[PDB]
């Protein structure tokens, strides 16, 4: 029964408007349900930013009962939702790798000479206009963000991410939930307790918890949103102006989405 | 040597523009220096809101060396600044008393039938217009504030305070100082540490402290600003409209001042 809501909560960690409950009860074709799951999962991963973009993430339904949702990588069974979110997180963590900096060391395209951008400006104009495949190293974009870009065939793509952590997501949403209390005496008491237990600790103590009893069961606890990817397949792929436009779009979507998730997080913080 | 700066820091806990260093080095008359100290201290106390308005707070300089500043109550020596701020705080705490609620139980005027306002509207119009002395119980003002008022002779006065604590002051200023870092990686690291040590703990760890080494020495650690009093002696004392005006003024000053102290606090948080 409960697999549908699990997956929806998972997706909800990112701006993923899953409608699986509106089709699972509609008798939708199993292959179309799986297809939609998979597209949702892939988008989810673009948002989470694990640097696992080099993999095929697929999602399936089970044939037996109690019907669960299988997470697969490259057609191999990896996880199931019934394992709880934390296990899925650790599973994905064993897959991710980081370089000398706190950044993904992987790269998207099959291995082999990722572009050492170094410096320069017309550096990439050549690549957008006159190049088959390539992928850049990370660009240390000054605006508090890191970005890289690649193209595969007729598809051009850019990703942007800020180094984040569910803990920063929770600090923001928890402080914001404390500010939204609108009960200065109770708020005062909780702020006073935050001095020793942090924002989250105080908020947990307010709801008759010992160490986040329901917290560990909920997804948002780990793998917050920290990245986004903009891609286009189509004539404009080499326009370059389109490329700056993608970058702008990506920054805008990153900021909007992480603020949106803090909004939803803060919301559930007060229930 | 160091007494001047101590007192100035003390006063700085509230919007008290002490200039004692500009007169102690000017050879100002000792009685005028003491007088100014005393007026400053009394204002400070109006701001802090200990419900000790029934006392005479006076401040003196010492004749010997190393010349210190004496805090007196009703002409008796109570504390000296060289004792550090925390001791002064505990001293004042032994003096304060709270009723069934987290409010001062004392009242301003000599004891005896503080006005049980209860309900009613023309309740007080009589008192402003046609009454010698009186003082109300606390009014549970809906706007997240508690207020009471009294008159002594030709002087009419109102106080307003919000129940506060230096810890709430520090939570606000610390979160605000974290947001003012403008270094998303370092900020991220400190936010992550806040999860277990609170905002203040993280900020202390960033400055090579174990438990706020210099923190305990600085005043702002305790007795934050939580109250303000507006008083007038003069014809308008019975105008009543003037009374609403005082109330408005008091709320405005309370909000402005506590925000100002959070500003200055946050400022020193990043040094």
Name, in order, each residue with C-beta under 8 angstroms of B237's C-beta and a sequence gap of 6 or more: B151, B154, B155, B156
Contact A191 B184 (CB under 8 A): no
A interface with B, Cβ–Cβ below 8 Å: 102, 144, 162-165, 167-168, 170-171, 175, 184-185, 188, 191-192, 194-200
Residue closest to B228 by CA, chosen among B164, B168, B144, B161: B161
Give bridge partners of residue A147 from the DSSP assignment.
A139, A160
Mutate to test the interface with A, among B100, B162, B194 (most CBs of A within 10 A): B194
Distance CA A248, CA A63 (A): 44
Task: For residue A7, say if its preceding peptide bond is cis, omega within 30 degrees of 0.
Answer: no
| DSSP H helical ranges for chain A | 3-12, 21-24, 30-48, 84-95, 122-129, 166-179, 184-206, 241-269
Secondary structure element (H or E) that encloses residue B76, with its range: strand B76-80
Vertex B174 angle, CA B168 and B177, to 5°: 145
| First CA to last CA distance, chain B | 24
Output the CA torsion sign for B82, B85, B86, B91: positive
Chain A residue whose CA is closest to B186: A163
Query: A25-43 burial string, b = 16+ CB within 10 Å, else e?
Result: eeeeeeeebbebbbebbbb
B184 closest CB neighbour out of A144, A167, A175? A144
Name, in order, each residue with C-beta under 8 angstroms of A126's C-beta and a sequence gap of 6 or more: none
Mutate to test the interface with A, among B175, B178, B193 (most CBs of A within 10 A): B175
- For chain A, how many residues are written? 271
Give bridge partners of residue B72 from the DSSP assignment.
B58, B77
Question: SS3 sequence, B14-43?
Answer: CCCCCCCHHHHCCCCCHHHHHHHHHHHHHH
Vertex A191 angle, CA A186 and A192, to 5°: 95
Name, in order, each residue with C-beta under 8 angstroms of B187's C-beta and a sequence gap of 6 or more: B178, B179, B181
A200 closest CB neighbour out of B168, B170, B195? B195
Contacts 24+ apart (CB under 8 A), B127-132: B127/B151, B128/B156, B128/B238, B128/B239, B128/B240, B128/B243, B129/B238, B129/B240
| Contact by Cβ (8 Å): B98, B104 | yes
Give bridge partners of residue B139 from the DSSP assignment.
B147
Output the CA torsion sign for B108, B16, B57, B218: positive
A185 closest CB neighbour out of B163, B195, B196? B163
| Contact by Cβ (8 Å): B45, B10 | no
The neighbour count for residue B271, using CB atoms within 10 Å, is 6
Distance CA A250, CA A230 (A): 6
Distance CA B122, CA B133 (A): 17
CA distance, residue A221 to nearest chain B CA (Å): 12
| Contact by Cβ (8 Å): B159, B148 | yes
Breaks in chain A, named by the residue before each, with C–N above 2.5 Å? none
Distance CA A58, CA A63 (A): 16
Q: A135 in helix, strand or coil? A: strand
Question: Mind giving me the DSSP string for B187-215?
Answer: HHHHHHHHHHHHHHHHHHHHTT-SS-TTG
Question: SS3 sequence, A195-259?
Answer: HHHHHHHHHHHHCCCCCCCCHHHCHHHCCCCCEEEEEEECHHHHCCHHHHHHHHHHHHHHHHHHH
CA distance, residue A89 to nearest chain B CA (Å): 18
| Contact by Cβ (8 Å): A45, A57 | yes
Give bridge partners of residue A62 from the DSSP assignment.
none
Q: B87 in helix, strand or coil? A: helix
Task: For residue B119, say if its preceding peptide bond is cis, omega within 30 degrees of 0.
Answer: no
Residue closest to A15 by CA, chosen among A259, A267, A269: A259
Contact A163 B184 (CB under 8 A): yes
Name, in order, each residue with C-beta under 8 angstroms of B214's C-beta and a sequence gap of 6 or more: none
Instruction: Judge residue A6's burial from the number of C-beta atoms within 10 Å of its C-beta, 0-12 exposed, 13-18 middle, 19 or more buried.
Output: buried
Q: A41 in helix, strand or coil? A: helix
Please report, to the nearest 10 degrees, the dihedral formed by the alpha carbons of residues B234, B239, B242, B244 taken in order.
Answer: 140
Distance CA A5, CA A23 (A): 13
The neighbour count for residue A93, using CB atoms within 10 Å, is 12
Secondary structure element (H or E) that encloses residue A159, with its range: strand A155-161
Distance CA B76, CA B65 (A): 20
CA distance, residue A188 to nearest chain B CA (Å): 7
Mutate to test the interface with A, among B179, B188, B221 (most CBs of A within 10 A): B188
Residue B223 phi/psi, 5-degree rounding, is 45, 70
Output the CA torsion sign for A27, A29, A31, A33: negative
Give every strand in the sheet of A69-73, ordered side by side. A57-61, A69-73, A76-80
| First CA to last CA distance, chain A | 24
* Residues in chain A closer than 8 A to B191 (CB atoms): 167-168, 171
Distance CA B212, CA B204 (A): 6
Distance CA B190, CA B175 (A): 11
Secondary structure element (H or E) that encloses residue B60, with its range: strand B57-61
């Amino acid at each position: 029964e409960d697999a549908l809501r699990g997956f929806d909560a998972l997706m909800a960690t990112a701006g993923v408007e899953s409608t699986i409950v509106k089709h699972a009860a509609s008798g939708a074709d199993s292959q179309t349900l799986n297809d939609e799951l998979t597209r949702s999962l892939q988008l989810a991963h673009d948002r989470w930013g694990l640097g696992l973009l080099h993999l095929r993430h697929e999602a399936r339904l089970d044939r037996g009962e109690d019907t669960d949702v299988i997470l697969l990588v490259d057609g191999r069974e990896v996880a199931r939702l019934s394992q709880g979110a934390a296990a899925i997180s650790a599973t994905y963590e064993t897959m991710r790798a980081q370089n000398a900096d706190d950044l993904s060391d992987w790269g998207v395209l099959p291995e082999g000479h990722r572009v050492t951008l170094k410096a320069g400006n017309n550096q990439m104009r050549v690549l957008v206009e006159d190049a088959r495949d390539f992928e850049t190293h990370w660009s240390s974009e000054r605006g508090g963000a890191f970005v890289r870009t690649w193209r595969q065939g007729e598809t051009l793509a850019v990703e942007v991410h800020r180094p984040a952590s569910p803990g920063t997501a929770l600090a923001k949403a928890a402080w914001k939930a404390i500010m939204s209390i609108k009960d200065r005496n109770f708020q005062r008491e909780l702020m006073e307790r935050s001095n020793s237990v942090g924002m989250l600790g105080a908020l947990l103590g307010a709801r008759h918890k010992d160490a986040g009893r329901a917290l560990e069961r909920l997804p948002e606890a780990h793998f917050a949103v920290r990245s986004t990817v903009v891609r286009m397949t189509g004539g404009a792929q080499r326009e370059f102006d389109q490329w700056r436009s993608m970058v702008r779009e990506g920054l805008d979507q990153l900021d909007e989405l992480q603020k949106t998730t803090t909004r939803h997080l803060t919301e559930i913080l007060r229930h």
